[PDB]
Symmetry: C3
Subunit: 273 residues, 3 copies
Amino acid sequence: SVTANIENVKKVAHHIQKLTSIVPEIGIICGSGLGKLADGVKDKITIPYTKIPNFPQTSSGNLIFGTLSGRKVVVMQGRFHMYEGYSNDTVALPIRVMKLLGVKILMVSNAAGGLNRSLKLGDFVILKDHIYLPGLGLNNILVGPNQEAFGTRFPALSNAYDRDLRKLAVQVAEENGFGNLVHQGVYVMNGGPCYETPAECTMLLNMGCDVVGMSTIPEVVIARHCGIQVFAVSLVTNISVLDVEEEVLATGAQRAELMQSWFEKIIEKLPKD
Amino acid sequence: SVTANIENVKKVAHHIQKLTSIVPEIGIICGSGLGKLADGVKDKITIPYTKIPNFPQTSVVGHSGNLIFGTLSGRKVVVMQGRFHMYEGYSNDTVALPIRVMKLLGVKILMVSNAAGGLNRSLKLGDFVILKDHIYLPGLGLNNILVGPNQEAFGTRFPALSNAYDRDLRKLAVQVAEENGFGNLVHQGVYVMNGGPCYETPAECTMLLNMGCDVVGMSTIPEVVIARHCGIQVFAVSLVTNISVLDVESDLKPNHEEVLATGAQRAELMQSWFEKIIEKLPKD
Amino acid sequence: ESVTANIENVKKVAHHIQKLTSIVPEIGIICGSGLGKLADGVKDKITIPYTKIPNFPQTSVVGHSGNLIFGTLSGRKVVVMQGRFHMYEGYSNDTVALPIRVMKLLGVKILMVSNAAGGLNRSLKLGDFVILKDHIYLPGLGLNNILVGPNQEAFGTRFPALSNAYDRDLRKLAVQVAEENGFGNLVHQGVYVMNGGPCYETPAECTMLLNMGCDVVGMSTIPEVVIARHCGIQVFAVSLVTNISVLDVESDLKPNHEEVLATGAQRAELMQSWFEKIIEKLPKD
Ligand SMILES: Nc1ncnc2[nH]cnc12
């Protein structure tokens, strides 16, 4: 792992800038099986991680540059999860690279378990807040010397999930007839990689959590630290079992396609400087 | 220290298999109250940890733990006399390795005891709490024993913990206690792990109780996670060695000495119980 | 890195300090929020930069090395830590623990600490004082307890109890002193929960912690307290409410570190007077 300090992050950024002339305004991270939720990318340039010195490596991932709905984007195909053993610096670096490349808004998707009992398989839950269990317990991604070039020692997490972006996302869903699928709620991070027990799920639900997953929050924290606005959404891929105690099942990719359309239509309506 | 991967785990298993002809069907981790069970193994072969190359080392004030092979109630067992607590600073791999070795040796069922504080107000000192579920506080906060590359040889990347405390074993254990006249001491409950090694404050105990926890301890969940990961069935019991203090204006404070005493006074009954459970475990 | 807080290393540090001063501290003080002035109040003193103590941990206050200050306060001998060690900075357990263990070897019997905290309890007002009567050590419950590792038997037992961690007699005295000196209305007692940090708590996190029965939240203190209790040092700790936690995600109010600092500095003279007046009333031989 290389330290995600300004000098290391600049070297990686400068290197990418030799490989593409596209200056992204929007960063997109697609979650576990949510790829292509960003690949109507027009006039694209594809940069494999292996091509970028000091950029983290997947256990084949790509950085994809291009235009979506008239706007310049960079899409991370392949994310870094704390349960895999990646360091704080490894996970922070891509987001800080995004900042140096010009990203102003980060759009994140993930798959999550539905804790809230009103949730259905296939629902979208826009994150309006989070509970960073690892961070409260001394594994916050910002532990260590503060990189001052990027942000302040004690970032506030007020309006972490930009309310104006959430409003827009909801309006876009409604306008395109899938508003009934969209909720807003609190995402809690389980460091993982075990799925949550019923007692764990009950505790988390009672803590005020709506969905649970193993990712996203660390990226959000780094984004907010360096002043990137954040939009994040969970796809509810399963309903959490709350108490201890064999059919033909379809597992299609329609929701993935829907989410892709959703992100494209949001980007279409984002403000542009 | 030594990675709990297939190569290293097989090397250890093979060393052990050179030292005994006993192929264990049941593994037992001796925690609080199981001291006499360990010493009552029939036709036992004792293998000190120090004698097993690459097997993690742990001592009780200097004396190495042992693997003990033999029979209990006519079934082949391996008993771990000497466990590995995370509060001692042992690595994820060090704690996982013995369990994965048990898997390769042939273990199908893991039985474990521990000492716990009683949060649930109905519990009495010396009660037995069969774990029916757990809350793995270190695991939720990025100190899960499986963090790191998954060892595919042993199990899947994201293990489900749905029926982690096998419902059939729990049923049997209750039945045996009931049949033998001590059903009144047996409960089932949710165990929450405190990394430790501090005892819980009253504010911590109040929070844990209100989270839905019945007992709190500093061990066991990591082993259970590794066991479930590699498909070993689990039976675990907490011995209530302290009644959790929930009021800060109290002068009663937990001490490991009385914890040891409770373990000592209940060891005979717990041994009887485990022996009688093992006798009735399915498939013999 | 780095230096183990075991008896050998702690003895070396203490013996070095003892070559610099003959003052035998009975009270140790960790300057947190509101105690910025305390160093200046200590009389007949010697100031020892951390940089001048071999194998002592290093940290900066303002733009200079932290200091260990020895002298007299309210007629009692004290050692003051000017510059503290926060886990969110990346310091090790041994680093945080060593100074407390050094205090023990120097003769310290009582540790007084202040810190800045967010007010979760809804009856709290900005600038209030919340004496800690108990805590919830989230990092500790989640396997980041400062004592994780081999137990150092010279200092304490493997499984410390945290009963009466916040000495009830010191808490009683502190309340009495505030009452007598006309600021009893600023003083509460409560449960402190540690957020590892360095992020301020989200509204959802604040709501969770409040419902867990926490009154204030901060990023320090508990690890030092655990080390003090382990080695038998009596503890008095107070949170200055430097921000009122935002529980509502649709609120425009937010914690601001400049304001946190201002709130702490504003209360500093009163906090210091309070500590000085508690020390004056402590029993002594
Ligand atoms: N229920 C769940 N818990 C944690 N991570 C998840 N990812 C998808 N579903 C999940």
